Symmetry: C3
Subunit: 289 residues, 3 copies
């Protein structure tokens, strides 16, 4: 009944989550996806993994074909999409090695194809105005957090827990990302303003991925990996990048376990009313109709 | 002498403002307008109307040819442009069913052709840097406000009236819009930040329409219709939607009355000096000259 | 060992900084630069100048080919780029006639080609994520500031000096620019928000020029001229006073630039140039 797609970011350019059956090349009305897809199973649940940047990480965030990636997963029968993203921290209690199950974002991207619908021949005919106040699938968000608990990963909820209960590495139960266009990182001025706005992390790939998943009627949740992009500040930059990469490798191992546990938890529940509600929200958001 | 163009937004896809005298299928140096232009009279005042999204509302906000629409109206001899827009509220005193005669905006659009001038073969030769501190025609703004008073619609002016005088439904005598690119609505995170910046309403179509009107030497004023896009929060979304659409239908009836009265009020005054000043501001903003 | 490129903004459409020894009518793998590049010398220091908007100021900010301008200077062997920009003030102590040696910015541009690298067939292959926390070359920033001191122009550093040391016209030793896409100026609503964010000046041309210079392994520094774009509040006499002051500001910036080229050539830059190139290599994520 359910099928989980996985969009792997940095650290997942060469997917190896499960015992691979075969790789699959697909075409899409909006172009080719970033790479071939790896098809397999976790339990009795079909799973398919797609590297966001391609196998060698040769595609930058602004040039990723998010429409083709999301539609390819849709056409393969996916009902859910779990995604990863490496990010920088903007707040004290989010430190390298932590994870964030995001629930909000502020969009600073531009020049990317961010909708399936329009009046151009390269899009589906129609005008679609999708509500995005809470842009993720809340059921799928809580499954990622429960998967972390099941794998004995600390979970921190700043609305219900003291800052001393912040035990790293932890999964932050909530968080907002500012998605910048890249490829450059932010200036200190820009980072200060983003921090003053209360944003938790900065990344480059969440939007329009999260928006297109909802346009496709798919349940989408993202888990962000906090890393460190400031090794240029240390005196021994070569040692710093080695230490940050080693911690990032350990973070990828944790996220791999969370993703595998989440796929099983998704396949254990019924999603009939949620999938139907995902499809109806698309229909009701059609202004031309 | 004076000739009033009207750009009808949502709810005005079939404007139906006056008896059609001429129907003009127009071509501009910047492409085709959203639809055929309908020419006629309101009283003794010549008037031209076009629907921003075309018949059937097939054109989303980001793909409207704002240059062709404004240029076509200018080409037919318009001296003024009155425009409508359906918007969502960001502040407590702006309630669905109110109207706003906008006087300010913050631009968050991208990827739209926003100027007639440039160095490319498809633009007018020159470099134009237009002042936009107060981006509307103030005379024409006050015409819309007087038109509302003449049609016995409450007018609330926060500059001179207390919040106790805010009697709904009312026309707000001033207001600022954040224009997002669409087609999606804002996240809660984005709406919270726009509200913290003091913006009154959110829409998707004001920019670059207001900018191009001033580039063309035209007097531009907008009247926003506050409606409700958050029907998903409701227990029975089917019931709220019908209530919101019924309120929106009443709103377009009153906006039609305001537009027709505003056209008559424009025609009752001399605009020689204002038109002359509109044209002179374009010439004085040419940096290449 | 050094060669200084100069990108002249408004007021420098016909630069004329030195005797023209030669001209270079060139194009790049990313298109045509804004105009012919003019080669010469300041003392014994090689210099190249190009007008950002081309002669006659026919190219608006959003259509300037920043990639081609930076690449053409790099192609001629430039090690540094000094750039000028005319800007408006967002804060009370930045008054028309002042200058700013920028050290920060907030980017509100869009639709401009802003990187040499990517997966497109016509770009340099690879994924380049350059750090930009402090986006200018700091050594070159201090050269511009020292050049102003050497030309008898007041310098104001709000980190160490009370506001009583802000004697106009002055070079502000640091400052942030919000770069808007243009061509229109900001609404009062937008200006109020930019001011509340603490930004010092507003312009239209700094980004992506500063980003691409770092991608190219070049030392880049910008000197802004504060002028006044709000004479519509008055009329033609207001404009004439603002234009005369801007003319004087252009003369001052000309003296600053010529002294800066001499100060750059008087020092060794082997280490800094090698660091510029090593930062490009270490920012390649595909490697």
């Amino acid at each position: 009944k359910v099928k989980v797609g996985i969009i792997g970011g940095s650290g997942f350019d060469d997917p190896n989550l499960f015992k691979k059956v075969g790789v699959r090349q697909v075409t899409t009305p909006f172009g080719k996806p970033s790479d071939t897809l790896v098809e397999g199973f976790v339990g009795d649940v079909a799973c398919v993994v797609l590297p966001r940047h391609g196998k060698g990480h040769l595609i930058p965030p602004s040039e990723v074909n998010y429409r083709a990636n999301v539609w390819a997963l849709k056409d393969l029968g996916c009902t859910h999409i779990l995604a990863t993203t490496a990010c920088g921290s903007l707040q004290e209690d989010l430190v390298p090695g932590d994870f964030v199950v995001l629930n909000q974002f502020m969009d600073k991207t531009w020049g990317r194809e961010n909708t399936f619908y329009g009046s151009k021949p390269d899009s589906l005919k129609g005008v679609l105005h999708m509500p995005m106040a809470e842009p993720f699938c809340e059921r799928t968000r809580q499954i990622l957090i429960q998967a972390a608990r099941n794998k004995s990963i600390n979970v921190y909820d700043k609305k219900t827990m003291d800052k001393s209960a912040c035990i790293h590495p932890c999964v932050h139960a909530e968080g907002s990302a500012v998605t910048i266009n890249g490829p450059r990182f932010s200036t200190r001025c820009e980072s200060f303003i983003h921090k003053a706005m209360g944003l938790d992390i900065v990344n480059m790939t969440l939007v329009p991925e999260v928006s297109l998943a909802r346009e496709a009627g798919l349940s989408y949740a993202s888990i962000a990996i906090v890393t460190d992009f400031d090794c240029w500040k240390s005196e021994e930059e070569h040692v710093c990048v080695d230490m940050v990469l080693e911690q990032f490798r350990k973070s990828v191992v944790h996220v791999r376990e969370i993703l595998l546990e989440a796929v099983a938890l998704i396949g254990a529940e019924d999603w009939t009313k949620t999938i139907e509600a995902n499809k109806a929200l698309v229909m009701s958001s059609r202004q031309d109709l």
